From a paper:
Human serum [name] (hTF) is abundant in the plasma with an average blood content of 200–370 mg/dL in healthy people. It binds Fe3+ and delivers it to cells through the [name] receptor (TFR). hTF is a ∼80 kDa single-chain protein consisting of two lobes (called the N- and C-lobes), each comprising almost 330 residues, separated by a short flexible linker (residues 331–339).17 Each lobe can be further divided into two similar domains: N1 (residues 1–92 and 247–330), N2 (residues 93–246), C1 (residues 320–425 and 573–679), and C2 (residues 426–572). Remarkably, upon Fe3+ binding, the domains of each lobe rotate relative to one another, thereby reducing the solvent accessibility of the two equivalent Fe binding sites.
Here, we report the molecular structure of the adduct formed upon the reaction of hTF with cisplatin. Crystals belong to the space group C2221, diffract X-ray at 3.17 Å resolution, and present a single hTF polypeptide chain in the asymmetric unit. Inspection of the difference Fourier (2Fo – Fc and Fo – Fc) and anomalous difference electron density maps clearly revealed the presence of a peak in correspondence with the Fe binding site at the C-lobe, close to residues Asp392, Tyr426, Tyr517, and His585 and of a peak close to the side chain of Met256 at the N-lobe. Close to the Fe (anomalous peak at 5.20σ), the synergistic anion malonate, present in the crystallization condition, was added to the model, as was done in the starting model and in other MC-hTF structures. The peak close to Met256 has been attributed to a Pt center. In particular, considering the experimental conditions (pH 6.5 and the absence of chloride ions), the long soaking time (72 h), and the absence of an anomalous difference electron density map peak in correspondence with the Pt ligands, in addition to Met256, two NH3 groups and one H2O molecule have been assigned as Pt ligands. The cisplatin binding site is located on the protein surface at ∼35 Å from the Fe3+ ion in the C-lobe and at ∼30 Å from the Fe binding site in the N-lobe. Refinements indicate an occupancy value of ∼0.6 for the Pt ion and of 1.0 for the Fe ion. The average Pt···Sδ(Met256) distance is 2.2 Å, in line with the expectation. Accordingly, there are no major changes in the orientation of the two lobes and of their domains when cisplatin binds the protein: the C-lobe adopts a closed conformation, whereas the N-lobe adopts an open conformation. (iii) The cisplatin binding site is distinct from those previously found for Ru3+ and Os3+ (His14/His289, His273, His349/His350, Lys489, Lys490/Glu507, and His578/Arg581),33 for Fe3+ (Fe binding site), Ti4+ (Fe binding site of the C-lobe, Tyr188),31,33,43 Yb3+ (Fe binding site of the C-lobe), Cr3+ (Fe binding site of the C-lobe), and Bi3+ (Tyr188)41.
Author numbering: 3 to 332, 337 to 414, 418 to 679
The structure:
Amino acid sequence: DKTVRWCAVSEHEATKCQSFRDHMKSVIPSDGPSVACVKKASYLDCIRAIAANEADAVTLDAGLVYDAYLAPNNLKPVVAEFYGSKEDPQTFYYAVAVVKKDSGFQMNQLRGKKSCHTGLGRSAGWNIPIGLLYCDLPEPRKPLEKAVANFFSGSCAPCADGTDFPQLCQLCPGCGCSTLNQYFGYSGAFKCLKDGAGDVAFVKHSTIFENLANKADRDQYELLCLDNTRKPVDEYKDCHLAQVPSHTVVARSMGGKEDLIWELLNQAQEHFGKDKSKEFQLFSSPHGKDLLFKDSAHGFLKVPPRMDAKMYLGYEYVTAIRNLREGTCPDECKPVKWCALSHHERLKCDEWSVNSVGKIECVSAETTEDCIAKIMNGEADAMSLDGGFVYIAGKCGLVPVLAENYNKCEDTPEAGYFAIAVVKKSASDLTWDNLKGKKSCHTAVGRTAGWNIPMGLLYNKINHCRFDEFFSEGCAPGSKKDSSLCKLCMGSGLNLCEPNNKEGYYGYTGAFRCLVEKGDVAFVKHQTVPQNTGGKNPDPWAKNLNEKDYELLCLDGTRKPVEEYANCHLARAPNHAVVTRKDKEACVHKILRQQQHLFGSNVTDCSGNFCLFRSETKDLLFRDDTVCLAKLHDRNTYEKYLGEEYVKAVGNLRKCSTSSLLEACTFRRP
Ligand SMILES: *[C@@H]1O[C@H](CO)[C@@H](O)[C@H](O)[C@H]1NC(C)=O
Ligand SMILES: [Fe+3]
Ligand SMILES: [N]
Ligand SMILES: [N]
Ligand SMILES: [Pt+2]
């Protein structure tokens, strides 16, 4: 049978669960999911139980979601509770540090300030902040209450041991652990700040808005960002300590019933959810309060499948709660863990590693998205991306550091490549203005030159991104294998239409090969045709060609030889870039520039010697067209770097794209 064993942690909870089971039997057909009710002693027991394969699901607070993630439990989030609006789910909240305007300090300057806490042991008001500040705490850090009283000059920490550590109760003597204390709770801690008792108050993103009606008043207040800037209170989503999931159903990583769990809970909310007016409410029980699910919930969203536990909690959270749980502190820039896609990339990376003598290390992952995810959650530090991946890496909170440069260095804005529409000279009927029902070749989908620029522009002409209806057939590696845009792809087995090496029509060169062999139009960079014509490319497919046989398509409507790319382009392309985490801009920016003048475009004969912009077999780690790694100056946002023109386009293209890492990242940041 298709049963979901639900874990209760109390007698009251089991009773509800039983009702849940029973009422489900009225509504669900026997060709549908069941509830079995498993009572355990605690949330930890439940976690073990699921891991043990004695239960299937339980709903956890964020701290516990973390514990469940850890081996030997290896549970993951599968369904999220949402609150209030359907349009706007209240899935996550943000822990913020709120300060007075012009109080004149940053996150890294909190030592000897007056802090306001919502209460000891609360996440937003304690666990998170103190978790992040853990390594700044004076030794010994046990007891933690002591080391915190020795950090801040004085504070209000409700439920703190004021008897032993008076500096914790200095703003609220006795440390009222109830609402008799004025400085207790969400509104409480915020009051502590407003009443000018404390310099900073650790609260939810929403506390500030619930305790100050008029915008005029809210302008007196800023947020401390972790990058040690401040920001208005309205920009809590870019300036927070952590992003915390409210209530999460969790399953086994592999062999869970994610699918079945969702099916059950979905049908469940359908018939018994908010205002379904039945005898059984899913978010209410006469037995108690918050049984199985928060009573305040409005329903469930399915957690996107790409989402592991670490990615769901976020880097900040994991960091803080890890420090709390482990309690391990270490200095300048350690090794930079670089992310390698392939076995051949890994090989080039091992060379780079041992040459810097430890100053570079190599983590490797299967796909690019696998690599981004590793940078995100700090298993890896940096890698080089296409502009279209930079977009994604950005939407996931990674930032660009250094652009790859092709032209002759260090300081150069622009310097980007050209998106070009390459045709065969002979068919003179082809124009940019009328490419409908033509065969087409893309580098991959979601790539700058191959997809983002060309299809971006083309969208402004058809007003949809369903391009496999516009073009007759084509090859656009990374499409749905059943799409007409996988018809031309030359990949064999499960490699057909796959955006990797094992698809011959993948990338700049591959899309051109496609054009040559099968397509009517290829979307590639300007440098592509020259490099793979006139005997330069020694492969049979490319050997005996010459660029005179090929032409570009210009926006106005005309054509021009492969040389007039100067003004026969589609648009200028955001250069390929190096992405990392906000908290590594400094580290990466430094160690790379230093690894550049050692092994860059100022030592030749890259045989026995090491070069950074040389590859054994095609562009490994960095392109081969690369000469130097540029400073970005202002442009270290994925918006600022790509430009709003690129972004507006990719925004439109998103309506159709299939990226699962993007899907997960925009679950947290809609
Ligand atoms: C490449 O750099 C040179 C340096 O002066 C510049 O003249 C040239 O225009 C650049 N690239 C282009 C757009 O041709
Ligand atoms: Fe590119
Ligand atoms: N597994
Ligand atoms: N597993
Ligand atoms: Pt497994």
